[PDB]
Amino acid sequence: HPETLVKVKDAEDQLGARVGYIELDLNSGKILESFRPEERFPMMSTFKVLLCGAVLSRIDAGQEQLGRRIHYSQNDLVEYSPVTEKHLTDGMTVRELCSAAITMSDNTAANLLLTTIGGPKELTAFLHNMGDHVTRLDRWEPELNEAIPNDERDTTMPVAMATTLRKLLTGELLTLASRQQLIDWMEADKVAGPLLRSALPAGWFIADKSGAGERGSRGIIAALGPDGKPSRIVVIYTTGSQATMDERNRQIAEIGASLIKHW
Template sequence: MPHPVRWGLAACVALSLTACTATSGEQPPTAATTPGTTPSPTVASPSPAPAVDHALADLEDELDARIGVAALDTGTDETVEHRADERWGYASTVKVFVVAELLRTTTAEQRAEQVTWSQEDVDAAGYAPVTGDHVDGGLTLDELAEAAVRDSDNAATNILFEHIGGPEGLRAAFERLGDRTTEPARTEPDLNTVEPGSTADTTTPAAFTADLDAVLHGGRLDPQDVDRLVEWMTGNATGDALVRAGAPDGWTVADKSGGAGALRHDVAVVTPPGREPIVLTVLTEREDADAGSADALVEQVAATVLDRFR
């Protein structure tokens, strides 16, 4: 099936874990915990490519990490998976799906309307680099959606949550995509803290890859809204050191990153020249990682997985 959109921006190559020092533009909460390795009960996935699976297992051992991957080549249906049915707190990666549901449920005219909020809303959200500068005049819903994806603005995300029916509205959106694994429960910043043993605000790599593929390639959105969402993902300010850094030269990357405590994630659509896109979810957990090494882990995972599709 021809892909409905084309993406710009060449991806850069920086494959060394030790050489990468870029840090994320996101500012994750400090009190996050992670949910352990409770398996998803609903998805039965095919066996991963053995060489990649072994390489990722070696990386886990080397770095004392847990790595979850689900990659789908939309042109060939080839998959690469590692711990694809285990759960992680999804952190800010969920913002791309909040925005997708806003695009599905509103018209361009509705999204052009001005929205306002209070300083208290900004303070409660914890991280608001765009909305914090526009308390007086407000922004349009389109501008808030762009801020949620490109800048990972928490206050913008909470305003969008209000327009899609809150976490319950997002849960219903996932169910319409066929996803009964992902469990939205709270808004920002609380969704970043997952209590041990809880499945609230968690997903699996397999679920998020299927969801992103359905949103972008399944006819769920009008083509112009797909273009708009991918444009925001392509220009996001928080992903340069993640999948984009691990992609081969000349491959374009549109992504949404996330991070909280020990977690560092990226969900992406990666397009090789002249080929159909690869949908990729990378979820990682490393207890002792600083921001740079956490980013480098995602980069190395992406490089390992995408090399399988060369």
């Protein structure tokens, strides 16, 4: 609805930065609403959903197993790794790593998983092969959250991320079991409370993944809908603001509120 666009533009004035927005119909793939759909924004942690999408693909092809245990040392530990710091002695299974990367945004878990699939270059090739010729991962954690102005590294476009998310969750790329596993991890996300979740009515379904980086970068991707069933995909990104975390969180939640109101 155009009223939501008013809110997106209002967010731009408040944050004094660009805000990319896309609202997509999960079933047909129709773009319902868009704002700066083809401009680039740094993905930040939102790429982790794509990463685990690629990991599940390999699991479907029998090249990987969810139960395989991966051992690492404290030399592998990077900034912000709540789950991996604690499982240093035991190591973690591929399944536990993806859960950690998506639900807790564990940075080391992302890096470990990146190594198993061939790194940034392979994730990018994976995306290209499924029809996404725009989204690209170039670096590892935490450098990929740098968000240098005009840098095309580690970026996506709102429309690309939206359509790619749709393919992973409802397309024939992954098996039913894997598509369900990916959406389950997203539904269990524990660090996206101030965002879309704070403006969601009771009983609604939501599977999301947020991101935060340098230079006021913030973002979130989500599949949501009433009656416990997802029916739309929303992607929101912003970068360049001097605003605090709370202020950026507030704007995204307000966009979510408008999105719900005019559903």
